[PDB]
Amino acid sequence: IIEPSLRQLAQKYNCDKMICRKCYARLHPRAVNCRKKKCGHTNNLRPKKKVK
Amino acid sequence: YQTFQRIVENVNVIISTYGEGESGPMGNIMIDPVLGTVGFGSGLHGWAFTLKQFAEMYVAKFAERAKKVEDMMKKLWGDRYFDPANGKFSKSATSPEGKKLPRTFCQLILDPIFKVFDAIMNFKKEETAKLIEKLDIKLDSEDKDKEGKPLLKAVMRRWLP
Amino acid sequence: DRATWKSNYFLKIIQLLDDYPKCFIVGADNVGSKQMQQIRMSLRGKAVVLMGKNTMMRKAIRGHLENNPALEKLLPHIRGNVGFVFTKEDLTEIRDMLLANKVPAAARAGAIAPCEVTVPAQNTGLGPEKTSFFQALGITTKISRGTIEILSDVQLIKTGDKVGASEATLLNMLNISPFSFGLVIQQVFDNGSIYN
Amino acid sequence: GRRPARCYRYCKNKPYPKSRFCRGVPDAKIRIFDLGRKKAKVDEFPLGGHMVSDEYEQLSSEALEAARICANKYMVKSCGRDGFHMRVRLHPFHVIRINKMLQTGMRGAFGKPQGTVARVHIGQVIMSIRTKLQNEEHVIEALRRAKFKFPGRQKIHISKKWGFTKFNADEFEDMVAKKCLIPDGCGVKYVPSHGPLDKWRVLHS
Amino acid sequence: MKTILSNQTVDIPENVDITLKGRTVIVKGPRGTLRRDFNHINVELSLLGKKKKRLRVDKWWGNRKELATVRTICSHVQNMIKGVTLGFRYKMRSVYAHFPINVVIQENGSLVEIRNFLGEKYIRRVRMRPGVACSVSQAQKDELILEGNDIELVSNSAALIQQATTVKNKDIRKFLDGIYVSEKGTVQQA
Amino acid sequence: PNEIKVVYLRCTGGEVGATSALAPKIGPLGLSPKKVGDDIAKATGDWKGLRITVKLTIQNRQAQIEVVPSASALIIKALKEITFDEIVNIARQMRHRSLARELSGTIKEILGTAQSVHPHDIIDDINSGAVECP
RNA sequence: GACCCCAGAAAAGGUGUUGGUUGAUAUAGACAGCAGGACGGUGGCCAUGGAAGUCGGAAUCCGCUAAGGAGUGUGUAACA
Ligand SMILES: [Mg+2]
Ligand SMILES: [Mg+2]
Ligand SMILES: [Mg+2]
Ligand SMILES: [Mg+2]
Ligand SMILES: [Zn+2]
């Protein structure tokens, strides 16, 4: 029963993020490259999928 | 109080959309706590109450008796605020001084229940004792010995059967 | 095509200044494209409204300064979201009709609210299925005559606070007038003059 | 049941064409070498783009078919089915053999035909696309995608020739104007200033 | 390429004074004293005027990576000035679907107890960094106030609380419970 | 509010429809017409643009008046059974005719452009009947 | 990482850094940020159970304009 304003606050840290397609890393929503060495900083990123 | 109001509104819109009109054969279907058509409480602990019961005990603290209980219900529920210090009802949210006033439901119905719950859950022996005397409840043996949540069950079960 | 668009703007402003010697500088508030078209039709008979880049204007005026002096008074004034309206009519007639053709702009979520609004205690006339919006705002409503009724006045939006999405949908739901604003006359130019 | 292409990547043998000595060759997988609007006139598609190999190697007929389809699908998507014309400029004329193992061993080890490859040289053109000027970025991307079907290293080039002709695009139009070139379908015919004068009188009339 | 000179200057307000011990900046303001040394960065720090108190950071013959340290130092010093004049105040909201998160502030705002996070019996005890004080605000029902002079310590304390209330073995897109940094502001609001 | 506010529009046209239409769904807004009222409403509206007929209605407590706004696709498809410049011209007079126009010539450009669903070279070199309409 | 034979590597990637090529924008105010607008015909046509810019097949216009695609994506049964 989280109110919408708090619900957006939690989703800022849990949901509004990008995911590396090679190494699944959790990245900030404006990311263009992965920050991780093990994938080679690939630009192959996808949005984190919503529960919607 | 807000949780109670949202549920009452949700039930009302259900029985107003799918239901028939007020001028229908049944009459008025919409439920209102001021009418005493809705109760509160817990079935597991065996205690429940209505606006009817609390109007009865405040009339006793204060036919013609049934009439005075009825119009007391309309004052126990709603957006009407009871000043604790002044000791009188009011229609304004703020006092003439400017203090925000608690509504009647929380101030003189929920407050005794919250005080009872707080005292028993915090094991305040003196506070529970004086609350029992003020609420003039009877406590038989084999149940006065128990303490904590079972003591809360026994106390509430007879205060609000 | 961008170069031709800029040169066409320069020819437009220069010719329009030559033809019209009397004009208002007006600052545009948060006015929509509907709002600008509403003003444009209301003034279409006799006046003309020209808006654009400030740097477009200021460069054009400086180039035309030698050809037509006394325009340099506009130079330390064209700042912010402003434009001109050109007219051959009198100051008062332009001003009071431009203040009369205002618009009840809707309350957009995520925008500051200059005005303070408060809902009256009246039957909304809406069906008993829009109760969820009232519950989000915490407004205690009841069903009377088969329609939603507000039991008491609720102070909804204060002055100078951001309008929430739930408030914005409710304002657009009850259709009541929110804060409303249009274009406001910054100053004047009566053949080389400055007034209020 | 085909071997990895790494087993036939390099031009190790002499050319082994299908002839009266090599018989029983299965048909190459690629049978279509021109796609799009092959019937378009010469002046409709003035831009030409090539995929050019940088390695002396062998490209299988399977790979040429895969890259032909890959470039065709992208060109159709971004330019329509009549906005381009593609020509695969490699033909798989070299037969590769296989010595099939279950006599046992290397005795009598000369193999049977397995497939066909095209032998490509450094600087040789593998594939060509001709189209209008405004589709230059689409040709580059289509050829870039088709590079992934080939083993070696390939470069995308935008030729200075007009379409599929052998004449420069900066002198093509005025040669047509002065009748040094005459269109004939997708290409042009070069008319030199020698021969019977009756051909010259056929022109200029 | 090695740039000849890359420099940047910060302005120090009147009520705060900055003292330099080589590459150790000491910022002393009304709210206290902050120290931070940048001996890991090879730069030239200098105080310019007695009139307006400018601090200048120079980097001579720097490549791409070590030209990025000039703005970093200037921003760290500006955070130091901001901390000793206005202070740092990170607000935190505790959100929950069902189980209210109970926060108890132990000795002098240095220890934080999270009791009923997602309804479990384990009690989290998060200790704030030295110089950081946590409190429960009286303006919101579920809000924590972290106050201190060093931004590094205040935000690290807020991150300690945030990472303490972490959901495990569940779908965190659905289970949104926890305490999150709601806004990052100052004290004294100037 | 004129004792009734039923200005909500309708998106049916041509055939009577009745039960097959959305009028049973949106009927409780006034609760007066129901199956009889939408039938008499459509009886007068079956002609006059047998197309989609995006229309607006007003209720007089038993009967309705169904004014059909002049939608460009409606009138062009209705007048179709070619330049027909005079035919479209005569249809642009009783229109709402606002169009954020400056001259009457802008309106005929707008619907000459709408009928592109070629009638575009007319818009390009247009010189005839610019001020003919007013 | 580190020297013929030679004793281990490829396609493909990198907003790590370095150099080079070509192109484009910009004091007529680039770029990035923050802040406003993002309109009418028109809920354009054919499609259908509903597709209103955003499942699709074609079209691809005009006026007001500083500008606004009969639409880049998210979203809705469709709207919003
Ligand atoms: Mg194998
Ligand atoms: Mg051999
Ligand atoms: Mg910063
Ligand atoms: Mg699980
Ligand atoms: Zn990664």
Unique residue bearing structure tokens 């001709």? D130
For residues E113 and E179, give the distance between their C-alpha atoms in angstroms, rounded to a whole number: 12
Beta partners for A7?
none
What is the CB neighbour count within 10 angstroms for residue C41?
15
Longest CA–CA separation in chain C, Å: 74
Q: Which residue is nearest to nucleotide G18 (CA to C1')?
A: E1
Quote the minimal CA–CA distance from F55 to chain C in Å. Answer: 23
Beta partners for A47?
A18
Unique residue bearing structure tokens 């004052």? B75
Give the distance (Å) from ligand 3 centre to CA of residue E190: 18
Least Cα distance to C102 among C112, C115, C89 occurs for C115
For residues C102 and D37, give the distance between their C-alpha atoms in angstroms, rounded to a whole number: 60
For residues F106 and F113, give the distance between their C-alpha atoms in angstroms, rounded to a whole number: 10
- What is the experimental resolution, given in Å to one decimal place? 2.6
For residue F22, say whether its CB is under 7 Å from any atom of strand G.
Answer: no
Q: What is the DSSP letter of B100?
A: B
Least Cα distance to D45 among D155, D116, D135 occurs for D135
Chain C CB contacts of B9 below 8 Å:
131, 135, 140-142
Phi/psi of residue D62, nearest 5 degrees: -65, -40
For residues C48 and C6, give the distance between their C-alpha atoms in angstroms, rounded to a whole number: 20
Sequence-ordered alpha helix ranges (H) in chain E: 69-85, 151-164
Beta partners for E133?
E147
Nearest CA in chain C to B92: C152
**Residue C118 has which token pair?**
């408060």
The 3 state secondary structure assigned to C112-154 is: ECCCCEEECCCECCCCCCCHHHHHHHCCCEEEECCEEEECCCE
Selecting from E172, E173, E176 the residue whose C-beta is nearest the C-beta of A2 gives E176
* Nucleotides in chain G near protein beta carbons (<7 Å): 11-19, 25-29, 36-46, 58-68, 70, 75-76
Beta partners for D85?
D36, D130
For residues E122 and E116, give the distance between their C-alpha atoms in angstroms, rounded to a whole number: 8
Nearest CA in chain C to F5: C125
Q: How was this structure determined?
A: cryo-EM
The 3 state secondary structure assigned to chain F is: CCCCCCCCCEECCCCCCHHHCCHHHHHHHCCCCHHHHHHHHHHHHCCCCCCCCEEEEEECCCCEEEECCCCHHHHHHHHCCCCCHHHHHHHCCCCCCCCCCCCCHHHHHHHHHHCCCCCCHHHHCCCCCCCCCC
C:F CB pairs within 8 Å: 5
Q: CA distances (Å), B8 to each of B32, B128, D164, in order? A: 8, 32, 80
Q: Decide if A40 contacts A21 (C-beta within 8 A).
A: no
| Consecutive H or E run containing E61 | strand E54-62
Give the distance (Å) from ligand 5 centre to CA of residue E172: 20
